[PDB]
Amino acid sequence: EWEPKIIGFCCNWCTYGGADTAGVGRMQYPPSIRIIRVMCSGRIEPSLILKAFKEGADGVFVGGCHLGDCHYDSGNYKWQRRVMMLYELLEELGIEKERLNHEWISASEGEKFQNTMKDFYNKIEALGPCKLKEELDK
């Protein structure tokens, strides 16, 4: 009767390739996520995640290179500092920290991406729908 709406932000060099690897190996995972491509996770900022929640996202996922393996040397270090602040801001706004998930997944980590998608889906399914859009539409 209800399925979570999850949005994803993946870097073109590692997590995007990691998601492609999962696909080449037919590594099945739940169909709630919709991925958006960026060149680096350093492109990800609070405005894109908060905009996703405003639009109705039940969960937001972000994927970047391993710390130290960014294709652009240090874009993921800036995103890491931004996401830690964002986790606590979401809690101040009544949004469960668990509705945001950020992971470091390489282009060769298809199995890890599959399990991260399964775990995040199960986590959001258990939390139920985020009632922000419903509260704003009143």
Partner 1 sequence: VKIATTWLGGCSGCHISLLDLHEELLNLLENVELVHCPVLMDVKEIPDEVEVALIEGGIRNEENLEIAKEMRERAKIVIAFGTCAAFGGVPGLGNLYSNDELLDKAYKTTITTKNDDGIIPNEEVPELVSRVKPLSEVIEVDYFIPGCPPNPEMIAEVVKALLEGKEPELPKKNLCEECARKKSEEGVAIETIKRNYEGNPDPEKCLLEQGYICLGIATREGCGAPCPSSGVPCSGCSGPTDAVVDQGAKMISALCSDFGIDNDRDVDPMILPKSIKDKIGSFYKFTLPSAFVPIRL
Report the interface residues with partner 1, using CB under 8 A: 45-47, 50-51, 53-54, 68, 74, 77-78, 80-90, 92-95, 130-132, 135-136, 138
Indicate the residue among 67 and 85 with the shorter CB distance to ligand FES: 67
d(CA 94, CA 64): 26
- In whole angstroms, the minimum distance from the beta carbon of 18 to ligand FES comes to 10
Residue 95 interface partner, choices ligand FES, partner 1, none, CB cut-off 5-8 Å depending on type:
partner 1
- In whole angstroms, the minimum distance from the beta carbon of 29 to partner 1 comes to 28
Residue 37 interface partner, choices partner 1, ligand FES, none, CB cut-off 5-8 Å depending on type:
none
Indicate the residue among 44 and 124 with the shorter CB distance to ligand FES: 44
| DSSP assignment string, the chain | -----EEEEEETTTHHHHHHHHHHTT----TTEEEEEES-GGG--HHHHHHHHHHT-SEEEEEEPPTT-BTTBSHHHHHHHHHHHHHHHHHHTT--GGGEEEEE--TT-HHHHHHHHHHHHHHHHHH----HHHHHH-
- In whole angstroms, the minimum distance from the beta carbon of 110 to partner 1 comes to 27
Torsion of the alpha carbons at 130, 57, 133 and 126, rounded to the nearest 10: -10
Binding positions for ligand FES, rule: CB under 6 A: 11, 13-14, 40-42, 64-65, 70-72, 75-76
Residue 46 interface partner, choices ligand FES, partner 1, none, CB cut-off 5-8 Å depending on type:
partner 1
